[PDB]
Structure formats: structure tokens, C-alpha cells
Amino acid sequence: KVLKIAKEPISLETPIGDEEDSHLGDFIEDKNAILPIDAAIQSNLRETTTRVLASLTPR
Amino acid sequence: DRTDDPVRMYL
């Protein structure tokens, strides 16, 4: 556990390309963001759950 | 006489 400490994290402004442009901030993905295709699937499921809950008795 | 150096002024 002493090893693998992840000391001195790399700066996000370090130029990945040889030139000054194309920094490291561009080649990064956002994991917390939800794609719209996933949110669209949730609406369909929320609507289909209401239609399926129509043949059962009220109780 | 301008320096523009804090450590230089301190020393």
C-alpha cells in the first residue's frame, strides 16, 4: 500500500501535442454526464410502466 | 533603479 501513491498529478494545461495547441484538457471524457440516448430510454420506460399498470385491479 | 524582484528587495 505504500507504493502507488499518485504523487504530483499532471497539469491539465500541459500541451499534449508538440506545438502549443491541443492541450490535455481536450482529450478528456466526462463520466458524470448522462447521454441523451440514455435519458430518452428512461422516458419510454416510465410511460410503458403506466400503460402496463392498467389491467390490474385498483387495489 | 527598478528591480521587479521581491526576493532581491528582501536581500
Partner: protein
Amino acid sequence: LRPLVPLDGGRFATSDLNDLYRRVINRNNRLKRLIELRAPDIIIRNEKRM
């Protein structure tokens, strides 16, 4: 806007804005500790300058 997202492999990657804020906080804490300890004017002046 100054994220600290961990890259692949366990090595983090932070923006360069955290360094400035960290240095400012450190210098402010050092000046606050200097004012309480009643240091000489030469050391307190250099702290304010920094």
C-alpha cells in the same frame, strides 16, 4: 471549472488554477501566523509583499 478528475491508471490530473489558490492560501496563513507571533517589521513586510 478547476476539475481534479482521476485519469486512467490512478494518476490524477488537476488544472493549473489550484496552484495559485493554494499558494495564496498558504501565504495568507503564513502572514496570519506572523501577525500573531509579533515578528519583526522586516519579516512581516516581506510577507505582505509576497
